[PDB]
Coordinates of C-alpha atoms and ligand atoms in Angstrom, one line a residue:
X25 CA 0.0 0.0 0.0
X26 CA 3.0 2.0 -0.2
X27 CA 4.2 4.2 -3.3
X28 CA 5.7 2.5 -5.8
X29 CA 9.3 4.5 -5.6
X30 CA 9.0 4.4 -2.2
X31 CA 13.0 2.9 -1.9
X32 CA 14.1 5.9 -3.6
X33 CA 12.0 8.5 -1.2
X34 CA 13.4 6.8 1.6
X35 CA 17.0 5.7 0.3
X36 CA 19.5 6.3 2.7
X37 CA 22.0 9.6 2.1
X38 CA 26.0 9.0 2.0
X39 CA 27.1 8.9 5.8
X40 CA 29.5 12.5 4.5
X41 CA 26.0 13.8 4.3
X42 CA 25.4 13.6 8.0
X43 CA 28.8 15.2 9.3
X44 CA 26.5 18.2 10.7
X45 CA 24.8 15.8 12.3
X46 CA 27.0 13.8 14.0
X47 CA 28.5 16.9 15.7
X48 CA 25.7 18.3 17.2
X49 CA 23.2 15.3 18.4
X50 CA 23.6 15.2 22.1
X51 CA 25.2 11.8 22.8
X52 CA 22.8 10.9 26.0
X53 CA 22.3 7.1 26.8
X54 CA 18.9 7.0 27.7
X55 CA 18.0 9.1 24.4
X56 CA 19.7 7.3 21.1
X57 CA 19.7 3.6 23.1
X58 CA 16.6 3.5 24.7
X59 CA 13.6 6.5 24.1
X60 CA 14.2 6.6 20.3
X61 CA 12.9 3.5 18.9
X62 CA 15.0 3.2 16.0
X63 CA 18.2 4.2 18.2
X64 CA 16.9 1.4 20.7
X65 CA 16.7 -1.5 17.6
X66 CA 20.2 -0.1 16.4
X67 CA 21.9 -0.8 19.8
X68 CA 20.5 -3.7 20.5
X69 CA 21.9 -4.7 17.4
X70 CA 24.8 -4.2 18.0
X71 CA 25.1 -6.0 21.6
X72 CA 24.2 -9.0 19.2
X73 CA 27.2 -8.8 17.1
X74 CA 29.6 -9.2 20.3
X75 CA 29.0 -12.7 22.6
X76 CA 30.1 -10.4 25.4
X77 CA 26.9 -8.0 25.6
X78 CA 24.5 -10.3 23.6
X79 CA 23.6 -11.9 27.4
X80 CA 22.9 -8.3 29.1
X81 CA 20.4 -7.5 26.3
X82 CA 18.4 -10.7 27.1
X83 CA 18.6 -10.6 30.7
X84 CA 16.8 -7.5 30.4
X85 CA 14.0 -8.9 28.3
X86 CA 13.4 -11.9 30.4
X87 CA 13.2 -8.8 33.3
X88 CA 10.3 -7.2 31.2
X89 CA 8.3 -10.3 30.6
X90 CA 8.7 -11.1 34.7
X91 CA 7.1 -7.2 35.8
X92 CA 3.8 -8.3 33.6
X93 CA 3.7 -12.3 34.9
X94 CA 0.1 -13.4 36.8
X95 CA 0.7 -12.9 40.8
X96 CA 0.0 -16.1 40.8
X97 CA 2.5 -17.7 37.5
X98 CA 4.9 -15.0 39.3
X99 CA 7.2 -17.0 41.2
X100 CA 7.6 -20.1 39.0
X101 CA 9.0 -17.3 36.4
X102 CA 11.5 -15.6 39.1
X103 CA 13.0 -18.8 39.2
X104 CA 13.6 -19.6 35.6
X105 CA 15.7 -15.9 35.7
X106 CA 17.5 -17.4 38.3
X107 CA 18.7 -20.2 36.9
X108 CA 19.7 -19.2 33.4
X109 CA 21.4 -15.5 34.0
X110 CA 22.7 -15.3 37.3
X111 CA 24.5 -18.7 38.0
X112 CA 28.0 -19.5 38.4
X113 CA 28.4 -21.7 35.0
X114 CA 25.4 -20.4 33.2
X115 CA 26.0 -19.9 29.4
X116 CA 24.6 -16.4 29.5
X117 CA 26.1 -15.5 33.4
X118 CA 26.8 -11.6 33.6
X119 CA 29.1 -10.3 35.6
X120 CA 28.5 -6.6 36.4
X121 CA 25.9 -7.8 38.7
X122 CA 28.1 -8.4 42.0
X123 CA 28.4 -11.4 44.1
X124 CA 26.8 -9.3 46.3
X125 CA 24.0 -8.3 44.4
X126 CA 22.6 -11.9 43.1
X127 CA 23.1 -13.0 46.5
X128 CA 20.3 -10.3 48.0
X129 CA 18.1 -11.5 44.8
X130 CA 18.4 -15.3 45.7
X131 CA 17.7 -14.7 49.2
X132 CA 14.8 -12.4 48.2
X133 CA 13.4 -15.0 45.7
X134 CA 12.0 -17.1 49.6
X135 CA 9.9 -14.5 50.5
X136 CA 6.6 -12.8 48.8
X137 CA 7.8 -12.9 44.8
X138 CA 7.6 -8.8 44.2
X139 CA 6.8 -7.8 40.5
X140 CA 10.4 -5.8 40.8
X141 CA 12.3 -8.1 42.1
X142 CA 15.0 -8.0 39.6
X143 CA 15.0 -3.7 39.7
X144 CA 18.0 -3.8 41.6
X145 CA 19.8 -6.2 39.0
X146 CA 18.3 -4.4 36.0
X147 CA 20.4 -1.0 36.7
X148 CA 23.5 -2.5 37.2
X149 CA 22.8 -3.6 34.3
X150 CA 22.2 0.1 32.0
X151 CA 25.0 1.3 34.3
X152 CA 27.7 -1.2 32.5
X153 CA 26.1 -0.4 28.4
X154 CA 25.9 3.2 29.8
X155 CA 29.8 3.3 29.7
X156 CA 32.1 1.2 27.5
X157 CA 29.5 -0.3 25.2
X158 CA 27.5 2.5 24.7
X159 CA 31.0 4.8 23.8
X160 CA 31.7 1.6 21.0
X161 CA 28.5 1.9 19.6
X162 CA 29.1 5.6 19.0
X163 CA 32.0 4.8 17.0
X164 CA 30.3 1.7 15.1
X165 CA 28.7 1.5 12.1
X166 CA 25.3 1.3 13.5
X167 CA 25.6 4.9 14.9
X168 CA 26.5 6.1 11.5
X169 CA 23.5 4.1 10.6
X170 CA 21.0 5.5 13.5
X171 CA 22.4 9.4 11.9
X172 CA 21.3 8.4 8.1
X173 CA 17.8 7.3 10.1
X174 CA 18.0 11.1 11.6
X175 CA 19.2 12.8 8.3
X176 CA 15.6 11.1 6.8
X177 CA 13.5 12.1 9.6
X178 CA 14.1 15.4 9.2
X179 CA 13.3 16.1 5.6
X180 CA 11.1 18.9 4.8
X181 CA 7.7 17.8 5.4
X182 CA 4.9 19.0 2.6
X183 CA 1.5 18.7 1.0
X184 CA 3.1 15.7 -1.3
X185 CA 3.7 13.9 1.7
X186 CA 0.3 13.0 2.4
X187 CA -2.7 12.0 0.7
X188 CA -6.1 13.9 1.6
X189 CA -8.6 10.5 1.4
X190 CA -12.2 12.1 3.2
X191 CA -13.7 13.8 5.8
X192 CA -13.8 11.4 8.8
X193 CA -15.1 13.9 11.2
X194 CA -15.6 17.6 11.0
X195 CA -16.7 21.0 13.5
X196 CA -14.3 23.4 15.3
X197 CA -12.2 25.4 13.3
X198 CA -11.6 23.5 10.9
X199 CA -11.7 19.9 9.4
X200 CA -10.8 16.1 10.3
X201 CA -9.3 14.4 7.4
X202 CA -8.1 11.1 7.0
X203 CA -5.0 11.4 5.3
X204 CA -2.3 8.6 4.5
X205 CA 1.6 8.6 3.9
X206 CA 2.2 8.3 0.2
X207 CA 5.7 6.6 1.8
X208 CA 4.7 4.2 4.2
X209 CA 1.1 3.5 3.8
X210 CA 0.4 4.6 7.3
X211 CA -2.9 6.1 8.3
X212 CA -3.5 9.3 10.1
X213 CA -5.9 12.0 11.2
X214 CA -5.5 15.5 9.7
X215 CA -6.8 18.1 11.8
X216 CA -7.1 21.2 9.1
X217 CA -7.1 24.6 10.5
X218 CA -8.6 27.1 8.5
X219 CA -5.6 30.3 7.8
X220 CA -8.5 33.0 8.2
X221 CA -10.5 32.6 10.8
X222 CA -7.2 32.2 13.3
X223 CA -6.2 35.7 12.5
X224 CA -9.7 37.5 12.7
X225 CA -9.7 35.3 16.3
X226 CA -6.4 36.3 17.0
X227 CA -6.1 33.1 18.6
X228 CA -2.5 32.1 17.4
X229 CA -1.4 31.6 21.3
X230 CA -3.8 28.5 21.6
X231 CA -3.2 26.8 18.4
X232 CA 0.4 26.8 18.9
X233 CA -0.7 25.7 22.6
X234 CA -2.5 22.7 21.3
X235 CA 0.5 21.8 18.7
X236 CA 3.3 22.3 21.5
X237 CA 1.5 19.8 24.2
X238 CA 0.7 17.3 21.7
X239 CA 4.3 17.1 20.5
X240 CA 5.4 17.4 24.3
X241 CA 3.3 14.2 25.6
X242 CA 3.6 10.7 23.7
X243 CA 1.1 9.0 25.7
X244 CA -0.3 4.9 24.6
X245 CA -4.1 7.0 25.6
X246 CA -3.7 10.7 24.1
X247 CA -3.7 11.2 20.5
X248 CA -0.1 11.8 19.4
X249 CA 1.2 14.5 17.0
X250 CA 3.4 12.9 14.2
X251 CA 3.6 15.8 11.7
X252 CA 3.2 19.8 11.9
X253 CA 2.8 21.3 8.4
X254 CA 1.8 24.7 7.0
X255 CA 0.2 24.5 3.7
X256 CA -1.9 27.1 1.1
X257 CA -4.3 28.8 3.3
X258 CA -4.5 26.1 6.9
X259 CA -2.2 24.7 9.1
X260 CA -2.4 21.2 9.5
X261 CA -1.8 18.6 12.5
X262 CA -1.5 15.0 11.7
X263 CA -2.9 13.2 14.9
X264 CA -3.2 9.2 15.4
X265 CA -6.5 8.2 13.6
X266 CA -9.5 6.5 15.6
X267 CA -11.9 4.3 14.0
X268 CA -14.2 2.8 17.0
X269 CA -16.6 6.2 17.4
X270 CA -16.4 7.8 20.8
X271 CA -17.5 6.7 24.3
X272 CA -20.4 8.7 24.4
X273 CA -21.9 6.5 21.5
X274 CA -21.2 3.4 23.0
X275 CA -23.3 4.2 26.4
X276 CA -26.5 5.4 24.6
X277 CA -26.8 4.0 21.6
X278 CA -25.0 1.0 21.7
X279 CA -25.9 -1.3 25.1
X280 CA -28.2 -0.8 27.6
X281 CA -27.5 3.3 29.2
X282 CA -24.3 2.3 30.5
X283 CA -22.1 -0.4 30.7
X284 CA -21.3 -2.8 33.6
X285 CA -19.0 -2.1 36.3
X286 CA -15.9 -4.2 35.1
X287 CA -16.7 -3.1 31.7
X288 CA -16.1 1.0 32.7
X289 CA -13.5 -0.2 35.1
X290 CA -11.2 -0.9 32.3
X291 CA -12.4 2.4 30.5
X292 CA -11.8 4.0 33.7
X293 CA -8.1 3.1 34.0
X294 CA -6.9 3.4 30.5
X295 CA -8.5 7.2 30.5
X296 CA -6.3 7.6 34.5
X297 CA -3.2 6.7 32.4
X298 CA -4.0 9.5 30.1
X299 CA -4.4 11.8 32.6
X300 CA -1.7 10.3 33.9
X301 CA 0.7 10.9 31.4
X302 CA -0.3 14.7 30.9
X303 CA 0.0 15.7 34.4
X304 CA 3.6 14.5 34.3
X305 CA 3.9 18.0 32.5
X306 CA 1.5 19.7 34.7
X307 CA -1.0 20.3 32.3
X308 CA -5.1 20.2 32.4
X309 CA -7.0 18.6 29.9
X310 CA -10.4 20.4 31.3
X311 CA -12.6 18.8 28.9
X312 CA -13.3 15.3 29.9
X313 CA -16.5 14.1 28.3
X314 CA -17.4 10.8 26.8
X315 CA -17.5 12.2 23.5
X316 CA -14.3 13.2 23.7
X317 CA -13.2 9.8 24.8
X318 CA -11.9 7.6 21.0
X319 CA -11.7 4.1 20.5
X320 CA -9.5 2.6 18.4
X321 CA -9.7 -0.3 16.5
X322 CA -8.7 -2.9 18.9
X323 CA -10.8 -1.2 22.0
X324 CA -8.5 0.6 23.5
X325 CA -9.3 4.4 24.1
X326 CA -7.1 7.7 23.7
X327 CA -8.0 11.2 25.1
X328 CA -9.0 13.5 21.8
X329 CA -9.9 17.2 22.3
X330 CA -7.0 19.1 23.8
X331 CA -8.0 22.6 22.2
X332 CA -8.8 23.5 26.0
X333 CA -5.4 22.5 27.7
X334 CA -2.6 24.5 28.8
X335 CA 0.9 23.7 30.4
X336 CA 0.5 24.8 34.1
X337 CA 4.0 26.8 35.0
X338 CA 4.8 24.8 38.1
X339 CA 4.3 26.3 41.4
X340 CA 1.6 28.5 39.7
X341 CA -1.9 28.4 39.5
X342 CA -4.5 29.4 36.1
X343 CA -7.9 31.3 36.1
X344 CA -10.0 30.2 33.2
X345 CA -13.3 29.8 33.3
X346 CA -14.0 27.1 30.6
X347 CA -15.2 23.8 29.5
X348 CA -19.2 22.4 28.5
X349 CA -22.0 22.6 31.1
X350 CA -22.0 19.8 32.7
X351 CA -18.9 18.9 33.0
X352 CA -17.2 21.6 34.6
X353 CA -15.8 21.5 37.9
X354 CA -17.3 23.7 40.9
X355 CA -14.0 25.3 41.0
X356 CA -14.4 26.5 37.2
X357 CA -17.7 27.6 37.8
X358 CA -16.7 29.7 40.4
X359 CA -13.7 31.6 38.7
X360 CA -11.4 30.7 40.7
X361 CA -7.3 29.2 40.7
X362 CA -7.1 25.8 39.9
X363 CA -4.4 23.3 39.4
X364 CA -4.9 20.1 37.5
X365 CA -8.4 19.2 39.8
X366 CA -10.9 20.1 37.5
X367 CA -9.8 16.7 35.2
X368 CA -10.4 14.5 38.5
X369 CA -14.0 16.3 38.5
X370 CA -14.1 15.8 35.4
X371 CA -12.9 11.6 35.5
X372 CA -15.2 11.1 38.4
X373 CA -18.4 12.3 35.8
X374 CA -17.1 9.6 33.3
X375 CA -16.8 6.8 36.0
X376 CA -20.6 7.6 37.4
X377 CA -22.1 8.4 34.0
X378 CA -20.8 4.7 32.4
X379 CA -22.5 3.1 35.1
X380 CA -26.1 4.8 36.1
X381 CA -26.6 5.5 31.8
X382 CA -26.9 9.3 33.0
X383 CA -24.9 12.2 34.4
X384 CA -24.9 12.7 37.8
X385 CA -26.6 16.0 37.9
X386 CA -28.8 15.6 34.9
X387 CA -31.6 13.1 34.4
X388 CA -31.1 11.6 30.8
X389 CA -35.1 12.7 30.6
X390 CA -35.1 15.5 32.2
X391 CA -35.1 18.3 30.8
X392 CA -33.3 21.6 33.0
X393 CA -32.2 25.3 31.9
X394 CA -28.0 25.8 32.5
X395 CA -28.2 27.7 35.4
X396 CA -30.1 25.0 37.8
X397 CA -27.7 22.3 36.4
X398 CA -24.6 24.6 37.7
X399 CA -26.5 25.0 41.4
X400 CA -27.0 21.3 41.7
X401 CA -23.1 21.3 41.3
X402 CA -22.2 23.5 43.8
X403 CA -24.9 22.6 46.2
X404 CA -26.8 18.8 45.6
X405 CA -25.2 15.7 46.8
X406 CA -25.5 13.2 43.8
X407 CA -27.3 9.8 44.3
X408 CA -26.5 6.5 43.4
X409 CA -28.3 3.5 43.1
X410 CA -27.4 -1.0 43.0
X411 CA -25.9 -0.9 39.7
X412 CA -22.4 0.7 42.1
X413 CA -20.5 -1.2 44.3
X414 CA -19.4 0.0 47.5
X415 CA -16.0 0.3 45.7
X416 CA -17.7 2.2 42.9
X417 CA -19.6 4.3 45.4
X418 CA -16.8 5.3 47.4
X419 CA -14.0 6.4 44.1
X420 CA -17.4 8.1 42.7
X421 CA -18.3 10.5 45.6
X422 CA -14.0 10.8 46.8
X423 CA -13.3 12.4 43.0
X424 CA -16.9 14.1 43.3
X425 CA -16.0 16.1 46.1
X426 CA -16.7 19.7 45.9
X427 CA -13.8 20.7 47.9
X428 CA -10.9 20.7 45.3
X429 CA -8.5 20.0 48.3
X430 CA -10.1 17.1 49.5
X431 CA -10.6 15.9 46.3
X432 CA -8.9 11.7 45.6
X433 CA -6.0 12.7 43.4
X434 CA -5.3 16.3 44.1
X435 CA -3.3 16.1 46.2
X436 CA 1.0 15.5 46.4
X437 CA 0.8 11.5 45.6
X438 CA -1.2 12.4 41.7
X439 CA -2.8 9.4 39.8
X440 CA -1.1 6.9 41.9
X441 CA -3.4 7.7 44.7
X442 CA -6.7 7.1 42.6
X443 CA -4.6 3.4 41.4
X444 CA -4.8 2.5 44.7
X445 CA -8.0 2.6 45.9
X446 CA -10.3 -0.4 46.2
X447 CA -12.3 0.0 43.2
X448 CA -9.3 -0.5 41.0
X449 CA -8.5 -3.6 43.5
X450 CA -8.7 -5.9 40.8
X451 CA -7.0 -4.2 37.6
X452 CA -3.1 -4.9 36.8
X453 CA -2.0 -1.2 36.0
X454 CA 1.5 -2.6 35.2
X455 CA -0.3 -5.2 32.2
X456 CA -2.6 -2.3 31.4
X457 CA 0.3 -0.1 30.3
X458 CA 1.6 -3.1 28.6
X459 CA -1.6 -3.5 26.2
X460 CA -2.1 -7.1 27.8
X461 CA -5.5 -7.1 29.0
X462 CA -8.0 -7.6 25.9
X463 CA -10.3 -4.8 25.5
X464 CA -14.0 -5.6 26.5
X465 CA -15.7 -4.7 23.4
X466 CA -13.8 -4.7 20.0
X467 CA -15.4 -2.8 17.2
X468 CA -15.9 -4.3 13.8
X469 CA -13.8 -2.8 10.8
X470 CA -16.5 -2.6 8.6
X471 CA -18.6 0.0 11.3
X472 CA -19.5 3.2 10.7
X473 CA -19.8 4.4 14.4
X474 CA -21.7 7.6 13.5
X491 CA -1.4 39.1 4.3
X492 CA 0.8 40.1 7.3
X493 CA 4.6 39.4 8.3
X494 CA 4.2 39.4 12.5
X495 CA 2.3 35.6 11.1
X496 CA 5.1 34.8 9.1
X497 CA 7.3 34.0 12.8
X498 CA 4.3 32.4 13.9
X499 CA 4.1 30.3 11.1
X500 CA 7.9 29.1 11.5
X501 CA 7.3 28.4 15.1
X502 CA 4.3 25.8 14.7
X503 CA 5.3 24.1 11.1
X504 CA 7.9 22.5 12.9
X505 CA 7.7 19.3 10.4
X506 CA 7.9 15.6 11.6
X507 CA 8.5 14.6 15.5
X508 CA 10.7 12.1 16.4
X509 CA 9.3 9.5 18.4
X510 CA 6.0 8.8 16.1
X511 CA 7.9 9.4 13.4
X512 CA 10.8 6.2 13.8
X513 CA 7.5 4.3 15.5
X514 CA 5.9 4.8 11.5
X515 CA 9.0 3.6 10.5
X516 CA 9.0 -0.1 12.4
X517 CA 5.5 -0.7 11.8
X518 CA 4.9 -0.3 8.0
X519 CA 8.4 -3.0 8.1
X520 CA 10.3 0.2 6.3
X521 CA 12.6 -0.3 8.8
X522 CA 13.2 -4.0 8.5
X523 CA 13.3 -3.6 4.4
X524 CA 15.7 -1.0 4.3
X525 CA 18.0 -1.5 7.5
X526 CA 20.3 -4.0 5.7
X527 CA 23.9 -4.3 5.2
X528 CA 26.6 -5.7 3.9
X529 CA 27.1 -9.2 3.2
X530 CA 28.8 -11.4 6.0
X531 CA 29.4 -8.1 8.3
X532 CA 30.4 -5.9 5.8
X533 CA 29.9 -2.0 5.2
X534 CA 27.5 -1.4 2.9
X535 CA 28.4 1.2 -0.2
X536 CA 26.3 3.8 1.4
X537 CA 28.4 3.6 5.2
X538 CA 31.8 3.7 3.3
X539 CA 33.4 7.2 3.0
X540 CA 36.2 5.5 0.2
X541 CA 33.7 5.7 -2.8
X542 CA 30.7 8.0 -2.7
Ligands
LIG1 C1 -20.3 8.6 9.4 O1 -19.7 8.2 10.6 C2 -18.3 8.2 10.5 C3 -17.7 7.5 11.7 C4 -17.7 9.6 10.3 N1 -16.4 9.7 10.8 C5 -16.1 10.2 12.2 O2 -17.1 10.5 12.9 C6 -14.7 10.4 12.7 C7 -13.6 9.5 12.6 C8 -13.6 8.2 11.8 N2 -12.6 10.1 13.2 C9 -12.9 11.2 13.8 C10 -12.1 12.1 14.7 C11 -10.9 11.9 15.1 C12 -10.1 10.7 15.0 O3 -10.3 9.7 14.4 N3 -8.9 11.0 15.7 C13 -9.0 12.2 16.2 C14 -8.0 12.9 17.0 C15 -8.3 14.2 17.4 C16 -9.5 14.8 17.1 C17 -9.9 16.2 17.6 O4 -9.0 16.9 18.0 N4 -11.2 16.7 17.5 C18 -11.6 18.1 17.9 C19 -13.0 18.1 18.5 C20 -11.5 19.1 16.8 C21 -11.6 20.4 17.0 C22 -11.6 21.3 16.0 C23 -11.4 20.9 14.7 C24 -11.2 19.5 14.4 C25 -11.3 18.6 15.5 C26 -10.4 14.1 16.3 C27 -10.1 12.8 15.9 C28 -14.3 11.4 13.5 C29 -15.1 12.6 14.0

């Protein structure tokens, strides 16, 4: 499904092309081996060539399988580890981890089996490839590799690129097209900003808001940001596509009104990973509302609308008064500072309104004026009914408190404090994150889930071109990577890595 000279767009540049490169990329571990994908695959890659590291690379996979294992399957797996990486004749024994250090695990192996048992082990582990491997790598070919990767993923970006398919979606400012890589093949979601009607709202500040934080955050439940071009009269993003209609579909017109309580648990958790992952740069989403809540094609969900977030300055506090009636938090209502609280409001609606088929302070038929549905927020103590646990109950009312300080998750602990409490007693966050717990309902494929120059800076500062995480991810799943990222024959540099004959 790819073009058809697709090797050519893609074919790698001479490594003398990436000499500017090379200078300048910061050479941090955790960056080129581990957070960029490709970078990741490259040094793994490389560990395999030498029997010396090609043991450390898969002691840390078996690691990775062990922090997902069943309570239960957990220590019959902790053995296995044992006895294979960290025994005195084992094929695959390392040695960075210290007498010492296996002989705590060992011991530790009798008691309770933890889920990070092997955390200890693991770092000595990234400490060792931090140092001597990690400086060979930067002088092997697979670095000069990892910079031709760099040199592609920062070609200019255009309308050629893509290819506008049809409007999936529509409203706002602007479109929702589903557009494709001519390259790869790989889907997206153009969101199409019309040029105009930005300037005569002289809101500039938010779009380039909305582009910043979604290139900022690469969350598994936000929509990511993958491309940022300017075109002939819009500015486009290119977000990850969702093809399983919105939550607010599947509790009214889909199922009974509502869902049962296991089933919105595992909406629940996914959507306090999302949150999750945007606090983590203290900002507020401030528009949670099942409509707003995507599913994908598999079942999962993903956050969409963030054209009402901003990046909180820590230590500071933000005044807007914004959002959809409803679904505002008293705090908002009343015009006051607010930190990130209004989204735990906000989570707490989405938890109660999956379960009772209603919101909380509005009868699905009945049929109230704005300003009585605000007092019932600031004053009425919302009921709940058998269809709730005590569990459910009790998470419901803690994020529905009116009190934003005594509110379950604003305080110093974040989202870890809503993970623990009983009503999430029986999820796995840790397999969650991991994508191994199936979805509860999986949608069908063939569904139809119904002229100035002050711009010109502002234009350079928000068509910013491809980002790098999505873009490498692109890479690995349309198997571009795996057709192209070969090399010589028998270890060999290819023609395009040798500097002898360009
Ligand atoms: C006849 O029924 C068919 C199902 C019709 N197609 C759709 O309804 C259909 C499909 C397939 N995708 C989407 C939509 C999306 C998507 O997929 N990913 C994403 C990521 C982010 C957004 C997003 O920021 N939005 C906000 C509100 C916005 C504000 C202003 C301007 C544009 C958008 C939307 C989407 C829609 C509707």
């Amino acid at each position: 499904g790819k073009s058809k000279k697709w090797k050519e767009i893609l074919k790698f540049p001479h490594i003398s092309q990436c000499e500017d490169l090379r200078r300048t990329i910061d050479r941090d571990y955790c960056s080129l081996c581990d957070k960029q994908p490709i970078g990741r695959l490259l040094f793994r890659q490389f560990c395999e060539t030498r029997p010396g590291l090609e043991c450390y690379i898969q002691f840390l996979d078996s690691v990775a399988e062990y922090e997902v294992t069943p309570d239960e399957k957990l220590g019959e797996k902790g053995k296995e580890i044992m006895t294979k990486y960290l025994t005195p004749k084992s094929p695959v024994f390392i040695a960075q981890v210290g007498q010492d250090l296996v002989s705590q695990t060992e011991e530790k192996l009798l008691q309770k089996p933890c889920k990070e048992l092997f955390s200890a082990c693991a770092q000595s582990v990234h400490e060792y490839l931090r140092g001597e491997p990690f400086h060979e790598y930067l002088d092997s070919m697979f670095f000069d590799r990892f910079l031709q990767w760099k040199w592609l993923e920062r070609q200019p970006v255009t309308k050629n690129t893509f290819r506008q398919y049809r409007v999936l979606g529509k409203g706002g400012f602007g479109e929702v097209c589903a557009c494709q890589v001519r390259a790869t093949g790989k889907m997206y979601a153009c969101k199409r900003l019309e040029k105009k009607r930005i300037k005569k709202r002289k809101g500039e500040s938010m779009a380039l808001n909305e582009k910043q934080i979604l290139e900022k955050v690469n969350s598994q439940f936000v929509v990511n940001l993958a491309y940022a071009y300017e075109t002939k009269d819009a500015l486009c993003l290119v977000l990850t596509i969702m093809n399983g209609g919105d939550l607010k579909f599947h509790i009214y017109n889909m199922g009974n009104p509502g869902f049962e309580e296991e089933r919105a648990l595992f909406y629940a958790a996914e959507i306090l990973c999302g949150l999750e992952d945007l606090h983590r740069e203290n900002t507020v989403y401030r528009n949670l509302k099942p409509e707003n809540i995507l599913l994908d094609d598999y079942g999962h969900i993903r956050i969409s609308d963030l054209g009402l977030a901003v990046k909180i300055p820590e230590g500071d506090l933000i005044r807007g008064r914004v959002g959809t009636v409803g679904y505002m938090a008293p705090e908002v209502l009343n015009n006051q500072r607010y930190g990130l609280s209004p989204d735990y409001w906000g989570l707490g609606c989405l938890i109660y309104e999956m379960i009772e088929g209603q919101s909380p302070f509005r009868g699905r038929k009945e049929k109230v004026k704005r300003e009585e549905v605000d007092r019932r927020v600031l004053e009425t103590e919302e009921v709940y009914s058998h269809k709730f646990s005590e569990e459910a109950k009790s998470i419901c009312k803690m994020l529905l408190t009116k009190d934003a300080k005594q509110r379950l998750g604003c305080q110093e602990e974040g989202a870890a404090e809503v993970k623990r409490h009983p009503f999430f007693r029986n999820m796995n966050f840790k397999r969650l994150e991991a994508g191994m717990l199936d979805p509860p309902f999986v949608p069908d494929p063939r569904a139809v889930y119904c002229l100035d120059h002050t711009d010109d800076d502002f234009y350079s500062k928000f068509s910013t071109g491809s980002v790098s995480i999505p873009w490498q991810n692109e890479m690995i799943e349309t198997e571009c990577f795996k057709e192209l990222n070969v090399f010589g024959p028998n270890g060999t540099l290819p023609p395009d890595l040798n500097r002898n004959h360009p």
